[PDB]
Design a protein around this nucleic acid. Structure first.
Ligand code: GTP
Lengths: 101, 67, 55, 190, 27, 148, 134
RNA sequence: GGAGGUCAACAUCAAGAACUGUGGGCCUUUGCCUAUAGAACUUAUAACGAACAUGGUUCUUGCCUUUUACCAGAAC
């Protein structure tokens, strides 16, 4: 009712990049950078993030065949049910993922 | 005070072309056209008050709400 | 409320006549049937209920 | 402005307004002597997002609402007596406008880099430095520059009088008492 | 538009429920 | 096949069909146009017992408004009348201008304001053109090297 | 001649976006660009006082690189040796009913003033509608 | 052996965002933790159907001599 969330560990999408290798990077301070994304309405910010995640993770349970194919954008960051209905972003939501330059 | 339903009227009258975003940043405050203490000028209820004295209105109202 | 109750009453009596025969068709029962005075052979009912009601 | 519809649900409405205070950082919740609660927010859509979470997510109560309103503020545009209720003390305070440029600057809290006017918040740093800062930009008063006393959630104060010359020993005892008596005053209004 | 005027609906009504603004009373 | 399900077409055929069907399937193509007209606004108008100017009218859903709590809260003494609050606001932001909304759906808010442009007259105008509507706005590499 | 005009606009357009021009000149130049989107709707109003077939349409096909004649010499002086009147009020009587019936319906006076103002009577009759009400 | 069938049977298709199988560990197989293999169809301005009918019960109504036939909103 409030949010669309994954509450079981077995269902967390498996990550190709091997999480425990990511946990190693956490020690070195220069290794990690915290970057927030900002901008005006409907510039693609949340749908930009949606690129990095699907490229990062191997299988996602919340992908319909419709959002995978093209037509409807998947929005991972817009978890809240209000944000889904309101068609908008209300509360900030991030993700922590490793990616190579 | 004038911005209630400002956005919809813009988007309804223009048939969905158009848009509005109302922000506060500059923090510009501006005087209300009335004279904060006058016991007379106001003219009756259930209409938006005439701009000649709007300040006695806002005062005599907030006060009644507050106490 | 008095005006509202007038509008209900007058329509309820006209419905009394209509259901009395067998129709609610407007076309059969033009207002001359209810409103012509009895001297011309109508009901001669006296209508206070048309108006327009302040809302 | 809020009030719960069934007044026996007031204890529940409080638990949520403490939550909503947390989750939405730009919200300002108040309570008056009229019993009502005031909710402040950036704009329409932002209020609309609270009241959905308020009604549905957090507090399951149903609540009355005011008409859309605003927040106002008071100012002045150009002799004196004031007296204690146990009249040992008598206080006299004049008020004046602040030059449009001055508040223009105060509206931006700033560290005073380059030719921009430093904010009043730097009073911890040398007040005589501030006296130069004020007199440099605005042609501010020479006597009042060193006499600018403290600042606020808003405008600025000045001590100019003979008693400040008479008893700066005894007055300096009562100053941190006076500034307490200001915030208490200007957080509200006449 | 229904701006607070007219009826909850015209069923118990006996009327059509047509609401029109008054020309007489404005100023 | 003969069972006749699952069709597949090529491009120009679809171009022909879309060309033929203009008297029927001609319609608006922005989410933005629909605005208050989309379902959710109709479901609201039904739940709140309002009406959009061209929208349908139902029965109240909560026919009892008649209970009243007589209180100083909303009194005319205490209200600042500066705006009508036309019913389109009650449907547009149902949780704010409204009080006691029940069985109300969230309305969807906004779209990007489509700028889409096509000229329908001359098919022989190119595909890429600058429309009247728009605002006016030391070393070398080897030869044979070109764009991809 | 849409296409030639269009071509000219394209050339004219070419200068503004990718070329350097005097500021006063450019702004006027841009404004014409603005109008094209606008459509000239303050530039198509005038004295078309011959019908398109009453102008015997001698559309003279000059080009501004001919060498032409201009016969200044014909501007010298020279030496040329060469119906029922209606006495019925039936038109009016129908308009005394209409008012009188609007008037004998209608509780109160504010809902009989809605009806009259809703007819939009012409200014000619509005003088004589008061005559009926009195 | 392939391409098909206005052919048939059987299984399945609204759920902690939501499936199974397997190896190991605690319990002593239900259940919990952990590693792993495979996930067709249906879903986010929510769904097998870019479509849209009828009935039943119980509430609140409307027509009002009574039942059928009905007015129109809700829940199931
Ligand atoms: N035509 C077009 N539309 C796009 C493109 N990218 C995004 N959109 C649409 O524009 C909207 C922006 O998507 P979002 O990511 O949800 O916008 P946002 O950046 O999250 O906006 P916020 O509410 O401020 O977070 C979406 O409705 C997309 O469908 C694009 O590249 N082309």
């Amino acid at each position: 009712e409030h949010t669309i969330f994954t509450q079981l560990k077995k269902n967390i999408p498996k990550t190709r990049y091997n999480r425990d290798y990511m946990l190693s990077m956490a020690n070195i301070p220069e290794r990690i950078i915290n970057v927030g994304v900002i901008g005006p309405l409907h510039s693609g910010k949340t749908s930009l993030m949606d690129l990095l995640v699907i490229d990062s993770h191997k299988r996602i349970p919340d992908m319909s065949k419709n959002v995978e194919l093209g037509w409807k954008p998947l929005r991972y960051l817009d978890n809240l049910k209000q944000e889904i209905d309101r068609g908008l972003s209300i509360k900030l939501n991030g993700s922590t993922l490793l990616c190579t330059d | 005070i004038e911005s209630a339903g400002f956005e919809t009227d813009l988007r309804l009258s223009t048939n969905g072309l158009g848009m509005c975003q109302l922000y506060f940043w500059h923090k510009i405050w501006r005087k209300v056209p009335g004279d904060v203490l006058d016991k007379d000028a106001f003219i009756p209820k259930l209409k938006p008050a005439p701009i000649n004295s709007l300040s006695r209105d806002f005062v005599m109202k907030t006060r009644r709400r507050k106490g | 409320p008095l005006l509202d109750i007038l509008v209900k009453g007058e329509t309820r009596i006209q419905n009394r006549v209509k259901l009395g025969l067998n129709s609610k068709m407007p076309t059969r029962f033009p207002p001359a049937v209810f409103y012509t005075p009895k001297e011309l052979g109508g009901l001669g009912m006296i209508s206070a209920s048309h108006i327009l009601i302040p809302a | 402005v809020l009030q719960p519809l069934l007044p026996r649900e007031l204890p529940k409405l409080l638990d949520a307004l403490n939550k909503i205070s947390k989750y939405y950082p730009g919200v300002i919740i108040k309570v008056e002597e009229s019993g009502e609660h005031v909710i402040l927010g950036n704009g329409e859509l932002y209020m609309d997002c609270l009241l959905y979470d308020l009604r549905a997510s957090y507090a399951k109560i149903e609540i009355k609402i005011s008409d859309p309103l605003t927040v106002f503020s008071e100012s002045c545009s150009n002799s004196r007596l004031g007296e204690e209720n146990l009249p040992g003390l008598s206080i006299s305070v004049a008020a004046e406008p602040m030059d449009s440029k001055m508040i223009q600057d105060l509206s931006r809290n700033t560290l005073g880099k380059g030719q921009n006017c430093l904010d009043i918040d730097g009073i911890m740093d040398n007040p005589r430095k501030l006296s130069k800062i004020l007199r440099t930009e605005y042609g501010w008063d020479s006597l009042a520059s060193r006499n600018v006393w403290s600042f606020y959630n808003g405008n600025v104060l000045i001590n100019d009088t003979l008693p400040d010359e008479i008893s700066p020993e005894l007055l300096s005892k009562y100053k941190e008492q006076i500034i307490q008596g200001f915030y208490w005053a200007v957080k509200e209004g006449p | 538009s229904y701006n607070g005027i007219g009826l909850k609906s015209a069923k118990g009504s006996s009327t059509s429920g047509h609401v029109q603004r008054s020309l007489a009373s404005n100023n | 096949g003969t069972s006749y399900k699952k069709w597949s077409f090529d491009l120009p055929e679809m171009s022909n069909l879309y060309r033929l069907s203009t008297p029927l399937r001609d319609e608006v193509t922005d989410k933005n146009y629909y605005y208050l007209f989309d379902k959710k606004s109709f479901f609201n108008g039904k739940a709140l017992n309002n009406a959009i100017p061209g929208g349908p009218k139902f029965e109240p859903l909560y026919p009892r408004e008649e209970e009243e709590d007589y209180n100083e809260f909303n009194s005319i003494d205490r209200v600042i009348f500066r705006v009508p609050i036309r019913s389109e606001y009650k449907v547009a932001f149902p949780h704010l201008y409204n009080s006691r909304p029940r069985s109300v759906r969230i309305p969807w808010y906004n779209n990007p304001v489509s700028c889409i442009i096509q000229n329908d007259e001359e098919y022989d105008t190119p595909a890429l053109f600058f429309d009247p509507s728009l605002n006016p706005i030391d070393f070398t590499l080897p030869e044979d090297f070109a764009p991809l | 001649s849409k296409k030639t005009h269009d071509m000219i606009w394209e050339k004219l357009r070419y200068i503004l976006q990718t070329q350097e021009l005097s500021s006063t000149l450019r702004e006027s130049l841009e404004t014409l660009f603005e109008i094209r989107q606008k459509d000239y709707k303050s530039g198509s109003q005038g004295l078309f006082i011959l019908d398109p077939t009453s102008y015997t349409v001698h559309t003279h096909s000059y080009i501004v690189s001919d060498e032409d004649e201009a016969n200044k010499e014909l501007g010298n002086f020279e030496k040329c040796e060469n119906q029922i009147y209606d006495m019925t009020s039936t038109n009016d009587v129908e308009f005394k009913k209409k008012i009188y019936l609007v008037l004998k319906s209608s509780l109160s006076g504010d809902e009989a003033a809605h009806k009259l103002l809703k007819l939009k009577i012409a200014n000619n009759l509005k003088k004589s509608v008061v005559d009926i009400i009195i």
